[PDB]
Design a protein around this nucleic acid. Structure first.
Ligand SMILES: [K+]
Ligand SMILES: [K+]
Ligand SMILES: [K+]
Ligand SMILES: [K+]
Ligand SMILES: [K+]
Ligand SMILES: [K+]
Ligand SMILES: [K+]
Ligand SMILES: [K+]
Ligand SMILES: [K+]
Ligand SMILES: [K+]
Ligand SMILES: [Mg+2]
Ligand SMILES: [Mg+2]
Ligand SMILES: [Mg+2]
Ligand SMILES: [Mg+2]
Ligand SMILES: [Mg+2]
Ligand SMILES: [Mg+2]
Ligand SMILES: [Mg+2]
Ligand SMILES: [Mg+2]
Ligand SMILES: [Mg+2]
Ligand SMILES: [Mg+2]
Ligand SMILES: [Mg+2]
Ligand SMILES: [Mg+2]
Ligand SMILES: [Mg+2]
Ligand SMILES: [Mg+2]
Ligand SMILES: [Mg+2]
Ligand SMILES: [Mg+2]
Ligand SMILES: [Mg+2]
Ligand code: NA
Ligand code: NA
Ligand code: NA
Ligand code: NA
Ligand code: NA
Ligand code: NA
Lengths: 71, 208, 122, 103, 33, 220, 129, 88
RNA sequence: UUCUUCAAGGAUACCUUCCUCAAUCAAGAACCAAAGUGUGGGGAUCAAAGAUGAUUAGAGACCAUUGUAGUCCACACUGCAAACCAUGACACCCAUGAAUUGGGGAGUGCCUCUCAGCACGUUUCUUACUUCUUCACGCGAAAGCUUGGAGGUUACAGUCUCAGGGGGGAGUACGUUCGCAAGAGUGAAACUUAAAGAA
RNA sequence: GGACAAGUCUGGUGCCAGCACCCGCGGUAAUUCCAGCUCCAAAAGCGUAUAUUAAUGCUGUUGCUGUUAAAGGGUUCGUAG
C-alpha cells in the first residue's frame, strides 16, 4: 500500500503538510485572505450608520420583499 | 466392501464381472471432468475412458448400505428424467417399496410446503446428475443427501455418493438398478445369497 | 376461429374417462348421452362438448392419448409390457464370447478375481 | 458503462498498439481493420433465368461447364453494416454468440 | 450520443474560445510594454 | 385449529420436540411460525416495529404505492429474528413482517470480557456484518458499560439479550433497511467462530426425523 | 522483490487454511520461521511439520488440523514495553481470552504470555488466533 | 468439557453445535445444505445388524462439489471401504 | 512485396562463470501518433482556406464539380491525444476445460539438395497474447473482476512512488522557466451555488 | 410539520405581511405567519453572533480513496532518499 518505513517519517510528514491545503475549512483558518475581505475584521459584531432603507425581493419559488437597510 | 470382523462376504464374484462386462457398464465417454478423474483406469487407443471396476463395486455396496439403513422405505425417492431409466425406476420401486418421480421434475416438490404433492424424502437417488440438476438444486435447500449414477463427464455439485457407471445405453442403466435392487434385498430381506435371483433384467429393460 | 376453450376441453375429458363405454364415433348418439349425464345450463356448450368427445374417440381408435388414461387399457398395456423372455438376454450374451480391449484385460489380470470365463481379447 | 468486454474490436491489451485502417466498402470511411465487419461474398454472374438462356446459346457452357463467379472481400463500417442489415442489435446475454465459421 | 450531459456547450469549442481570449490579452499588453 | 404441514411441525405439535436447541442443532428450516409460538413461552415474544416506508413503481397514468415494513422479534436472552415484507396496506405489511420475523430465528452466543463471574453479559468476540455499504462492528466490553450504539442497533441488541457492547459503524447508515440487517448478520456470526475451548471432539447423535421416524410413519 | 520471508510464510499458511487444505509447502524458510512455527505447534495450533534439505534455503511441509483462523506478520517490527502488552492485545486480537502476539526479546522468540511472566519486552513479530 | 465454564462448574453455553468431520468447522443453524448420512453395520452374515455409523458434511463442501471426495476419505478411515484390491 | 547487407533483442537448453552486484524513485536525461513551424527538394492522389452548382424560410453546412497550404523525403524545432486496459512498478498464494505462438524432452504422408530433412498424430514442460455459453472460492453500490484480480482487507501492516479532497469561477489572472511562433510546464483568489455526479 | 420532546384546538391575514440555521410554510379550511388556550424541555437561568474542540475513517501513523463517482505521470533511464 502506502509507505511503511520505520525510517520514513520525513516522507510521511511532508505528505501531510502538502495535502492539508486541500480542504477549504483548514485553509480558511491559516491564510489571512478571509479576514481582509470580511467587513468585520474577525469580530462578532460591528457598529455602523444607516444610509437608506431598501427592499430586496425573494428568490424564485418564494415571493416577498425582505426589508433591508444599507449600512 | 469391508465390515467389522471382515469375512470376505459382500465382495465381487466372478458372475458379477461377467454381467458388468457383458453389457458394457465399464465404458466411459471421450472427455472427463476433474471430479471423476480418480475413478478412471486407463484409456483406449480410440479415446474412450475405462472405469475401474473395483471402485464401481465399492461405491455400489456403500450406497446399498445407506438405503437399507432407512427404516421406512417410503422415505427414499428415486428420480430420473431420461427415458431409458423410467422403466427401471418403476420396477425398483415395486421390489423395494420406495416412492419415485419420473419424467419432468416439478420445481417446488421439495420446498413449496402448501401443496398437494409436497414430499419430504430422507435420501435421494438420481440416474444422472446433469439432467437431474433441478432435483439436486432443490435438495440443497432442505438438507437431503443425494446418491447419483455418474459418468466420466459428470458435474459433482450437490452429489454425496457417486457410483461411476455408464449412464447411456438402455441396458446399462437397467444393469445397475438390477444390481442395486438385489444388493438391498440381500442386505436385509427374504432373498438368500446362495440361490440366484429369479427376476429377469429384461423386466428392467425399457421398451416402447 | 373455432377454438374450443378450456371449459369445453376439460369436461370432454371427464366424460370420456367415466363413460368410455356407450360412446362411439357418431355425434348424434353421443349428444344424447352427454345431455343425459350433464347438468349444464347452456345448450351451446353441450353441443361443443359432444363434438370434442367424438374427436377424442376417433383419435383413441387409432392410438393412445396422453390425457385420456383409460383404466382397462392401462392394465392390458401393463400386462403386455411386463413380459419376461424365456432366457435372459444377458445370459445369452455371457454364453457367447465377451470381447474386451487389451487395457480392459490389463486391469482384469491385476484384479483379485482374475479374468472370468468366456472372455477373449478379440 | 462498458458495453462490451473486447470494446468492439479484436485487440486484447498487451498485444498491439495500432492496426492499419481500411476504407468502408460503401461510404468510404476509414475504420481499423479488426473493428470492421468483414464478409467474403461468392456471387454468380447471372441468375437462374439468365444462366439458362446464355448456356443454351453457348457451346462452352452448353454441356456441364460451370459459369464464372465473383469473389470479393467486403469490409464495412459499423453504421453501414447496421443499415444494410448485415448485422443487427441483439438482446443482452445474446451478444456473446460467436459463429466461428460461415454456415 | 457517447458522453454524459456536458455542462454548457461542447468542451472542445469552449477550449477554443478561451485560447482566442488569451491571444487577444497577449496582444493588448504588448502595446503598452 | 392449526394442522401442521411438515414433519417437524407434526413433532412440535406433539411433545416429541420441546427445545429450539434440538431444532438448531440439525439446522433444519422452520417454514411454519406456529412452531416458534409453541416453543417460546409467548410471554417473551416482544415484537417491535422498526420502519415503515413507501415504495413506488411508475406506470402509465400515474404510479403505484406499496408499503415495506421491518419487524424484529426476540426473546429476553439468546434469540433474535428480523423480517421484512411488502403489502398494499400498512396493516397487511405489519402482520406479514411479524410472521417473517418469527420464521428466521437464530441463537446468539455470549461470553465474558475478563474473569468469569456470573452469567455472560457480552458477545465473546468481535464480529462484523455487512449489507450493502453499511458495515456494523461489535466489540466485547467490560461490564457496567451499557450498549454504546446508535438508536437502531441498540433496540436490536436489547432483544438479543446483550447488555454490554461497543459499536463501530461505516457506510451510509442513513438507510435504515441496511442498518437493521447488518446488525442481524453480525449477531448470527457469533456461533460460527471456532474458539479454542470447542476443539474437544464430540460424538454424533441422530436427527429427529430418524429417531421418531416410526411415529411419522403411520397416518398422514 | 521478496523483502520479508516471515511475512511470506505466514501469508502462505493463512491462505491454505482459508481454502481448506491439509498441507502447505513453504519456501525459502529460515531460523525465524522455524522458531515461529514451534510456538504455534507447542500451543497446539498446526501439527507436525518437517524440513526438507537442499543445499540452499530449505522448504517446509506443514500439516494443518483446522484450528487456525488467521496468522499474520506485523511490519515494521514496532517496539513493545512490558507495560505495552495490553495495548497490542486490544488492537489485533479478537478477545483477550485466546490468541497470541509473538515477540522477539533477548531471551528468544516467544509469545506475550511467557514474556510477561519473565517480565521482559521487545519487538513484535506477528500474531495468531 | 464442552463450552464455556464459569468460575464455578456451571456450563453457561447453550446449544453446543456440530463440528464437521471433514473440515473441522462449526455447522451453524442457518446452513440449510448440511446433511447427515447413516450407514448400517452388518454381521458376518449378509443381514444388517441394527447399528449405524453417522457422518457430518459441512454444507459449503457440497456446493463446491468436493462432498464426494470427502466421503471417500471418511469411509476409508472408518474402515468401511477397501482401499485397494487384494493380491491374487 | 522480394533480394542483398549492418548492428541489436527476447524465449529455450546447460553438472558453464560470478557471488548480493538488487526493488522503486524528487532533481536530471532520452524517445514520443496527427496537426503545426524553419530551410532545401518533390508534387500523382486526396484535400483545411477559397470558388462555382444545388437543397433550404435562411444554409454561411451536410450533397456535387474543383482547388491552395498540407499529405511524401532530408536536416533542425514543437512535446501535446479517448498518448485508454479510462486499471503505476517489483514480489507471494490461489479451481477447472478446451484452444493458440516460440523453444526443449520422450503411428502417418513427402523425400535428388539452406536435407542424417519437413509436416502431422499421442503424452509432458518453460515462456507469451486469451477464451469458456458445461469456469471456482471470494469481492464489489452495482455494471462487473477472478492465476498481470477490481480476490487473499474493520479477522484492517510485503516494498517503493504519483495524484484527490462538494459543483462552478478555471487550468483562468499575476509572477517565472522553456519555445522562431503556435504554445507547453508551474498555478491562486474575490465572488457564486445545494446539489453536481455514479450504477 | 421533520431532524427533535410537545396540538389533526380557536380567531385574523390571503404568495401580502412574515417565518424558515436545512427541507420548506403563506395564492380563502395555514398541523409552520400574528394572537388566545393547553403542552414540552431546563430552570435562576435561558436565547442570539463570532471563533474553536468532538462529531469527521470529510487529512487516515493506528486508519481513507484513485476501471466508470474527484484522482495512476505518454514511455523508458536515473541520483539523493
Ligand atoms: K467488430
Ligand atoms: K445512444
Ligand atoms: K457514520
Ligand atoms: K469538397
Ligand atoms: K494529458
Ligand atoms: K512467439
Ligand atoms: K478466465
Ligand atoms: K454477476
Ligand atoms: K498554460
Ligand atoms: K473519502
Ligand atoms: Mg508482446
Ligand atoms: Mg493508440
Ligand atoms: Mg450509452
Ligand atoms: Mg465522466
Ligand atoms: Mg501483399
Ligand atoms: Mg507530420
Ligand atoms: Mg514542412
Ligand atoms: Mg516546402
Ligand atoms: Mg478533387
Ligand atoms: Mg472501487
Ligand atoms: Mg488499510
Ligand atoms: Mg473542489
Ligand atoms: Mg442555530
Ligand atoms: Mg399545510
Ligand atoms: Mg473538528
Ligand atoms: Mg499508464
Ligand atoms: Mg509528459
Ligand atoms: Na481505449
Ligand atoms: Na490518464
Ligand atoms: Na504562464
Ligand atoms: Na445510466
Ligand atoms: Na471517531
Ligand atoms: Na473520473
Amino acid at each position: 500500500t502506502k509507505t511503511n518505513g520505520q525510517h520514513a517519517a520525513r516522507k510521511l510528514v511532508r505528505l501531510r503538510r502538502k495535502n492539508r491545503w486541500a480542504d477549504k475549512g483548514w485553509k480558511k483558518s491559516h491564510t489571512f485572505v478571509a479576514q481582509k475581505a470580511n467587513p468585520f475584521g474577525g469580530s462578532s459584531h460591528a457598529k455602523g450608520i444607516v444610509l437608506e432603507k431598501i427592499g430586496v425581493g425573494a428568490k424564485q419559488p418564494n415571493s416577498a420583499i425582505r426589508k433591508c437597510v444599507r449600512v | 466392501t469391508s465390515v467389522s470382523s471382515g469375512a470376505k462376504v459382500l465382495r465381487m464374484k466372478e458372475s458379477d464381472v461377467q454381467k458388468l462386462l457383458a453389457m458394457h457398464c465399464h465404458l466411459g465417454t471421450k472427455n472427463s471432468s476433474s471430479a471423476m478423474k480418480k475413478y478412471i483406469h486407463g484409456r483406449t487407443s480410440d479415446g474412450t475412458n475405462i472405469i475401474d471396476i473395483h471402485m464401481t463395486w465399492e461405491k455400489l455396496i456403500l450406497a446399498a448400505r445407506v438405503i437399507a439403513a432407512v427404516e421406512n422405505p417410503q422415505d427414499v425417492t428415486v428420480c430420473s428424467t431420461r427415458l431409458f431409466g423410467q422403466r427401471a425406476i418403476f420396477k425398483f420401486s415395486q421390489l423395494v417399496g420406495t416412492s419415485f418421480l419420473g419424467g419432468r421434475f416439478i420445481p417446488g416438490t421439495f420446498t413449496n410446503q402448501i401443496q398437494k404433492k409436497f414430499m419430504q424424502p430422507r435420501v435421494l437417488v438420481v440416474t444422472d446428475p446433469r439432467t437431474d440438476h433441478q432435483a439436486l438444486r432443490e435438495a440443497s435447500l432442505v438438507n437431503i443427501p443425494v446418491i447419483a449414477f455418474c459418468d466420466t463427464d459428470a458435474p459433482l455439485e450437490f452429489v454425496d455418493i457417486a457410483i461411476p457407471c455408464n449412464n447411456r445405453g438402455r441396458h446399462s442403466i437397467s444393469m445397475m438398478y438390477w444390481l442395486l435392487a438385489r444388493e438391498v434385498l440381500r442386505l436385509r430381506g427374504t432373498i438368500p445369497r446362495s440361490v440366484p435371483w429369479e427376476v429377469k433384467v429384461d423386466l428392467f429393460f425399457y421398451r416402447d | 376461429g373455432k377454438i374450443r376453450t378450456k371449459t369445453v376441453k376439460r369436461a370432454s375429458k371427464q366424460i370420456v374417462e367415466k363413460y368410455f363405454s356407450k360412446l362411439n364415433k357418431d355425434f348424434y348418439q353421443n349428444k344424447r348421452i352427454v345431455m343425459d349425464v350433464t347438468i349444464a345450463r347452456s345448450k351451446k356448450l353441450k353441443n361443443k362438448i359432444a363434438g370434442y368427445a367424438t374427436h377424442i374417440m376417433k383419435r383413441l381408435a387409432r392410438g393412445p392419448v396422453r390425457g385420456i388414461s383409460l383404466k382397462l387399457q392401462e392394465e392390458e398395456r401393463e400386462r403386455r409390457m411386463d413380459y419376461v423372455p424365456e432366457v435372459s438376454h444377458v445370459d445369452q450374451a455371457i454364453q457367447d464370447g465377451i470381447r474386451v480391449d487389451k487395457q480392459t484385460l490389463a486391469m482384469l489380470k491385476r484384479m483379485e478375481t482374475g479374468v472370468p470365463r468366456h472372455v477373449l481379447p478379440n | 458503462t462498458t458495453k462490451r468486454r473486447n470494446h468492439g474490436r479484436a485487440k486484447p491489451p498487451c498485444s498491439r498498439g495500432r492496426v492499419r485502417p481500411v476504407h468502408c466498402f460503401n461510404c468510404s470511411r476509414l475504420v481499423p481493420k479488426d473493428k470492421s465487419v468483414g464478409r467474403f461474398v461468392v456471387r454468380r454472374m447471372l441468375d437462374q433465368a439468365s444462366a439458362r438462356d446464355v448456356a443454351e446459346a453457348s457451346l462452352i457452357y452448353g454441356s456441364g461447364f460451370p459459369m464464372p463467379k465473383l469473389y470479393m472481400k467486403q469490409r464495412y463500417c459499423i453504421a453501414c453494416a447496421i443499415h444494410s442489415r448485415t448485422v443487427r442489435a441483439r438482446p443482452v446475454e445474446d451478444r456473446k454468440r460467436r459463429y466461428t465459421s460461415k454456415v | 450520443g457517447t458522453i454524459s450531459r456536458p455542462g454548457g456547450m461542447r468542451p472542445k469549442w469552449h477550449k477554443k474560445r478561451i485560447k482566442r481570449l488569451k491571444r487577444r490579452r497577449r496582444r493588448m499588453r504588448q502595446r503598452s510594454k | 385449529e392449526w394442522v401442521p404441514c411438515t414433519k417437524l411441525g407434526r413433532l412440535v405439535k406433539d411433545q416429541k420436540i420441546t427445545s429450539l436447541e434440538e431444532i438448531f442443532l440439525f439446522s433444519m428450516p422452520i417454514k411454519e411460525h406456529q412452531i416458534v409460538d409453541q416453543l417460546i413461552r409467548e410471554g417473551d415474544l416482544r415484537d417491535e416495529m422498526m420502519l415503515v416506508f413507501p415504495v413506488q413503481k411508475a406506470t402509465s397514468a400515474g404510479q403505484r404505492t406499496r408499503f415495506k415494513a421491518f419487524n424484529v422479534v426476540g426473546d429476553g436472552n439468546g434469540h433474535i429474528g428480523v423480517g421484512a415484507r411488502v403489502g398494499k396496506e400498512v396493516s397487511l405489511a405489519i402482520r406479514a413482517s411479524m410472521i417473517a420475523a418469527k420464521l428466521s430465528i437464530v441463537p446468539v452466543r455470549r461470553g465474558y470480557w475478563g474473569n468469569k463471574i456470573g452469567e455472560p453479559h457480552t458477545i465473546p468476540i468481535k464480529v462484523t456484518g455487512k449489507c450493502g455499504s453499511v458495515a456494523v462492528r461489535l466489540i466485547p466490553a467490560p461490564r457496567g458499560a451499557g450498549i454504546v450504539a446508535a438508536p437502531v442497533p441498540k433496540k436490536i441488541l436489547e432483544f438479543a439479550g446483550v447488555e454490554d457492547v461497543y459499536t463501530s459503524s461505516c457506510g451510509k447508515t442513513r438507510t435504515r433497511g441496511n442498518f437493521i440487517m447488518a446488525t442481524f448478520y453480525a449477531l448470527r456470526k457469533t456461533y460460527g467462530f471456532l474458539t479454542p475451548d470447542l476443539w474437544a471432539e464430540t460424538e454424533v447423535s441422530r436427527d429427529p426425523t430418524d429417531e421418531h421416524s416410526e411415529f411419522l410413519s403411520m397416518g398422514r | 522483490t521478496m523483502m520479508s520471508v516471515l511475512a511470506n510464510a505466514l501469508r502462505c499458511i493463512a491462505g491454505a487454511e482459508r481454502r481448506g487444505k491439509r498441507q502447505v509447502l513453504i519456501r525459502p524458510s529460515s531460523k525465524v520461521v522455524v522458531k515461529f512455527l514451534q510456538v504455534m505447534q507447542k500451543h497446539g495450533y498446526i501439527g507436525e511439520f518437517e524440513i526438507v534439505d537442499d543445499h540452499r534455503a530449505g522448504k517446509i511441509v506443514v500439516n494443518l488440523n483446522g484450528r487456525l483462523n488467521k496468522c499474520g506478520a506485523i511490519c515494521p517490527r514496532f517496539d513493545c514495553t512490558a507495560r505495552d502488552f495490553e495495548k497490542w492485545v486490544k488492537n489485533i486480537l479478537p478477545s483477550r481470552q485466546f490468541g497470541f502476539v509473538v515477540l522477539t526479546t533477548s531471551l528468544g522468540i516467544m509469545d506475550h504470555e511467557e514474556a510477561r511472566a519473565r517480565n521482559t519486552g521487545g519487538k513484535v513479530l506477528g500474531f495468531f488466533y | 468439557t464442552i463450552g464455556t465454564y464459569n468460575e464455578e462448574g456451571v456450563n453457561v453455553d447453550l446449544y453446543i453445535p456440530r463440528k464437521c468431520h471433514a473440515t473441522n468447522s462449526l455447522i451453524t443453524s442457518f446452513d440449510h445444505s448440511a446433511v447427515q448420512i447413516a450407514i448400517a453395520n452388518v454381521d458376518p452374515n449378509g443381514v444388517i445388524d441394527g447399528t449405524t455409523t453417522t457422518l457430518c458434511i459441512a454444507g459449503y463442501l457440497r456446493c463446491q462439489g468436493e462432498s464426494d471426495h470427502a466421503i471417500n476419505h471418511l469411509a476409508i478411515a472408518k474402515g468401511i471401504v477397501r482401499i485397494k484390491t487384494k493380491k491374487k
